[PDB]
Design a protein around this ligand. Sequence first.
Ligand SMILES: Nc1ncnc2[nH]cnc12
Ligand SMILES: Nc1ncnc2[nH]cnc12
Ligand SMILES: Nc1ncnc2[nH]cnc12
Ligand SMILES: Nc1ccnc(=O)[nH]1
Ligand SMILES: Nc1ccnc(=O)[nH]1
Ligand SMILES: Nc1ccnc(=O)[nH]1
Ligand SMILES: Nc1ccnc(=O)[nH]1
Lengths: 520, 520, 520
Amino acid sequence: GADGVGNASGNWHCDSTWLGDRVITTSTRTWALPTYNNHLYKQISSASTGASNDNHYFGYSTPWGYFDFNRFHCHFSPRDWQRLINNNWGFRPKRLNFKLFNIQVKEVTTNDGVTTIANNLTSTVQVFSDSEYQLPYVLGSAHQGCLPPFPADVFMIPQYGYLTLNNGSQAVGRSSFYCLEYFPSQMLRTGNNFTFSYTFEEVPFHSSYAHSQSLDRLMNPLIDQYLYYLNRTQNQSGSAQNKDLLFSRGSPAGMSVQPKNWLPGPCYRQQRVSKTKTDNNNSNFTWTGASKYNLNGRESIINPGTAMASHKDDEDKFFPMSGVMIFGKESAGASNTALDNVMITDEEEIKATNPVATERFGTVAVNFQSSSTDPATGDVHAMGALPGMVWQDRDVYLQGPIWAKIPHTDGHFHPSPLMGGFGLKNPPPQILIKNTPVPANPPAEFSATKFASFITQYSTGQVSVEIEWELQKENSKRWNPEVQYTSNYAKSANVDFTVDNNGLYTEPRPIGTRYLTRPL
Amino acid sequence: GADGVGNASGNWHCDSTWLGDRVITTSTRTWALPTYNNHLYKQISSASTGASNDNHYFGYSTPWGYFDFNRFHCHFSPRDWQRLINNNWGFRPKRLNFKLFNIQVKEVTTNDGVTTIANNLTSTVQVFSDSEYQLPYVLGSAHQGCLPPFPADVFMIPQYGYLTLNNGSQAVGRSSFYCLEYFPSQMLRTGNNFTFSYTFEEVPFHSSYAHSQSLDRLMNPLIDQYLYYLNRTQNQSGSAQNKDLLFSRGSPAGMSVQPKNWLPGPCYRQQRVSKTKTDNNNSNFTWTGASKYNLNGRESIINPGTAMASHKDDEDKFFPMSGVMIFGKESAGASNTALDNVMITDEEEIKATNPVATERFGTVAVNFQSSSTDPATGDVHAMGALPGMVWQDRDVYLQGPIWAKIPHTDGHFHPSPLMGGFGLKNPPPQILIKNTPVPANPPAEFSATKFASFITQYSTGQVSVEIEWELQKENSKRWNPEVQYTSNYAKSANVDFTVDNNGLYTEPRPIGTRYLTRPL
Amino acid sequence: GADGVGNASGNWHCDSTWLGDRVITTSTRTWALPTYNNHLYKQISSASTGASNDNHYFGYSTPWGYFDFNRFHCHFSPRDWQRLINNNWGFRPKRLNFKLFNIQVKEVTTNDGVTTIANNLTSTVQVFSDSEYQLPYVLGSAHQGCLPPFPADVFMIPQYGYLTLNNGSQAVGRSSFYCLEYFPSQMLRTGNNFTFSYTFEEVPFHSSYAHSQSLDRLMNPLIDQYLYYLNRTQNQSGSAQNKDLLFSRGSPAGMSVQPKNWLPGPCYRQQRVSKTKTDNNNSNFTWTGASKYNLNGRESIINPGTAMASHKDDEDKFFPMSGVMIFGKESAGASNTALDNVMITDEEEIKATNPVATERFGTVAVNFQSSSTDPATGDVHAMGALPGMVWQDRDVYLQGPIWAKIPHTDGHFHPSPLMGGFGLKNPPPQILIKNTPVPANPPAEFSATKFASFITQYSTGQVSVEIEWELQKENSKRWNPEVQYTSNYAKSANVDFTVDNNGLYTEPRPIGTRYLTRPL
Ligand SMILES: Nc1ncnc2[nH]cnc12
Ligand SMILES: Nc1ncnc2[nH]cnc12
Ligand SMILES: Nc1ncnc2[nH]cnc12
Ligand SMILES: Nc1ccnc(=O)[nH]1
Ligand SMILES: Nc1ccnc(=O)[nH]1
Ligand SMILES: Nc1ccnc(=O)[nH]1
Ligand SMILES: Nc1ccnc(=O)[nH]1
């Protein structure tokens, strides 16, 4: 860093600047970091517990905390998101600037049942960015502890832990252990500060638009095709039914039978469930009726799974059991909370190109028809990629994640993070931070045994993240007005995206980005 | 070439040089080339024979031989492979240098029942590289006849033959015939030599590592998600069972139900068979229970097929019927040999990302549940590519192939050779070689009829291949030690990868490359 | 020194960098230093005690602490050690850089109960390196208190004390007393830091290899010698036994009787003891059956003593009573702990050249044979250096010492530290450190009586040691694969060289360096 006890090492830079094709978000917050695990690394696992085989794990927990800004509301105020989404066909991150500063380390002494805090001026906090990605990448799993949406909220830094290979609750020889200290890290006293910058790789702009055409309506509703298709295998009222081969040319009255160039996207069917409970089966079918994948004898719910439309027209009451992103309200309990404490996303806009999530992809022949054998077909519920398929990826949300690390594998296929966002080979590095252990008084006589008595402390300061975002401007010739995200004009007891009478900021709904429209 | 009867046209260059990010393998061997087909091109096919429709073919056999180094042990000694695999996250070929030399053509005369060999000094051997790929590409089908693993072994050059279109055992008008002479070729007497170089296209480094995380364990086992999922469709001990909609947030106790970004790789299920025969069905089900593809009314076993893990945890006794590479021991007979004369590979390391080969990919919804209709799901056994899938390709082995030509098609999809290795648009060219016909004595009076009487001969010499390989160095922060390929320290009658008391080199096991670990 | 209360004077530099022929280890840790002896130097000795004459001593204890990094795990993580040992025939230290910084001095006050710690900002810690070696050299006696293996562990600094001449528990006129203050030292307040560098003398690379030949198997196993040896002193079935002189030439069937050039190493026999207690004698024979040296009427166990192989082939259950380095587990008690709380090294690799530790060196003639007198021979249990002897020094271990000061004597003989490592004429200097006394309040009236009332304090900070190591690369033409140190692939409850569920780092075995092989 820096300088004095008596001298701030950073100012408060929270702002938005719009500049034609760029928008620069700056956000600064005040954090608090406790001591974790008493400065220990612990082995952790599902041993005992009583966990099922699909829940076993092995890993470690760490004395470190970390910074996480991997949520859009860490950077975009509600109004800015609104600006973003109502005027642009897309956007992407380009560069970032990160700042830790104004650090202040404090000691806690308890006597009684009356707790005193003071400054420990000569104490440090340690920091580093894992810029060579040598640590297990724990961002992009949508874990809580990101910078809060509301700039006035103070936040506690999450603790870093990670998993490795496990065979049940045991480890394997291949399992990996990381000690964080065995990086180089920067050591900061109250005077000092930390900074680094980062550039994002080139990535496709996120599609902030719905289509205003669908795959099956790309033709000109005024002209025939020059192409023919088999229309009838029997006449044709000449009594009664006689084998025939009758061919018709593509025609505006038969848009369902016209040859075309393209196929809709992939499909992994999911179970349709209603918001009115009375429609559903009387059982507990989530695990048992769930779409799951099977990995080394362990089952995992596919969630949210392939980008698919949530419901066809007029059926907004249904949703895939595990195919929509779902946010909790600020009233929601951790487990088995009710419908009205959650907010379910809707990905209905993609039904122009993407199969609906709770229906078949389609139908396939399954035999050879003949006079003796009747033509049979079967339903296709899971369809991989076929040449000619086109699709739309899952939408992002003001409160969803931004990016994830693409796994380091021989093979990916369209590695856009299924929960939504940008896939990055070389994503924003993890930023780790810890209070340096400060021994309590040692004995008068040497002892070799692990030092286990420490002065209790924690730290606080500010953090600042600045991101530059490039915009894809809208160039639309559409004559009529667009759907636009808008707040509600009718009167009410509270304003949306505001604090209440107890000062609790709330986000009353998810907001996606798909309001403007393109042609296909 | 060159020069004298009395003057070598090449030396013996067999070596290894390690140079930081590069390793240069040189190997030289001594070959023998007979006269094939008596200098004739023969039409060949399955006519007569009694072959089934799935085995019919049409093609030609050729008077030529060819060189084949498309196996790792043609270049890497066992110790070098060990060096490779224990210290690098990857590697790829960059360039090659090829050399034919010290040629010596010999005539064989038999009188009795006592066979005399002498030098035929004025005789040639012919050579060319098919550098414009004008010939059917016969490398990359894993045919025997490559340079031997052991530098002291002499090898016989394989004969070139190829196939074309066939309708049963007949040909079609579209079928193609190639005459090799109707290239330009180099003609070598005992003095001369042949050389050429080649550069490899840019290709992804082969992944010589296992992952130490799995797709389903990428989260931080310490923090909840901000995302919610439908947890129950009924309460919840309020008696008895009542329709409900209950939502929970992602949590470390429920890692199987957390939303995620990624899907595991593709899947084409295969039949699971045990190494202890008593477990299996009492029938012959290989063709009949086999995963097969169907091409122009002809069936073909998919083998090895999609890259998939061989068995889940603790089940090393099972293997896909035709989903693992299998090497023969030097005791193995050509057909119906026993389990202990073969070596079956294990691709278990990829179960972090790739479905296990003998299980479903997963489960899919197949109907609409309601009070009247119970939720149904189905098993998915063959799953194509879905956006968001990530996977690991099949491993290579010290004795497996290196590369294959990607077919010249409009479309490939991840054209990594399914048997393992590097796909190359423009692979190392085939190198063809033949002894020039040397007429026996003609008659005293002209005759127009095909010349059919030849002096019997063959040739021998050395061949040298030098390849430069680029290495991907390991940069791992892992605190604990790695699994490392190691020879066995316990005492025995023979050393691994050695010759025995009769001078037979043996390779006692396959060695893959996946020992070091990455994060995902 | 520089600057501020508010300003870190050092960062955290813990890392490893591999660069071809060099590897640079950096390690940084956080220490704690109490006040020792209440700022007093005390005379100490075995007086009273009840000590045997063998355990009498005289010396002094000091108010100072010291830094000790003389253990390989202070610098090499387990993975790095693995890298070291599996790829290099040797290595040596070249240069070092040392850093003390971020110091923070604290005062402790108690009422009862209850104990209060604050910063004492104007307090100093003192430091110096004994670079002219003017102090008794107390490193290289394998003391505990070195930097901990695990970078996250905080450590207490050991106290400096030393011994001098003693006659029983009394001193002699020749006994030396040393006052540490009498040395210039650097005085550091919370702002300041200490640094120095050092270069190592030229030393032989440590042998990180086993031989793959033995002294007695160097001959060509195909060819006779031209040399002859007396084979028989009687015939030879011509009945019955008659005096004769019969000579044979060296031959592959008689490799035990072939003339040779070399002798195996020196020998000081030690008592063989089994790991299965039932094999041993029923008595307490360690002191009484021990190999001891006798110095000024005082006995001392020779331990570990001459470099000798721990056991011959197939006898891994025996070990020299005091001829192997033995590490304690983190469960081991200080005294009379059980077999399974210790880890015994094995120096079996050196049996190619070095006598086995529990057997005779060999046999010697002891008389003149004649018709009247039968040839006699005797066993040699202690053999000094003979021209022509060759030997291998004791191995080093990841947790053993690195170096020791060669005593300043007229004569050494192969002064490689018998406990293992590098002998250094001018070793890394001792680094001494102390909290400066801070008087409590004096009386209002002068008193000359030596001050004795002090404010209670201690200090803490970071220390950093960087060492450059030169590597001897492996150049082996060995065709088959090597033994390699490897972690175990089978599954278990804990990972090797990791922390457990209480955060205790453990080292589950010793690791030597001898895996690669040389010829002799
Ligand atoms: N969002 C995304 N990030 C990186 N690569 C992609 N390829 C397709 N979509 C992508
Ligand atoms: N091994 C490989 N060779 C060429 N192209 C590839 N694309 C993906 N894997 C490949
Ligand atoms: N390790 C060592 N250090 C210094 N001198 C030696 N002489 C023989 N071995 C030695
Ligand atoms: N990864 C991809 C494959 C095919 N098309 C895409 O847009 N992306
Ligand atoms: N061919 C490929 C398609 C998608 N992803 C890959 O890695 N390769
Ligand atoms: N000549 C010597 C041999 C060994 N050591 C010595 O100091 N001198
Ligand atoms: N000290 C020594 C004497 C003789 N030879 C050695 O290598 N060392």
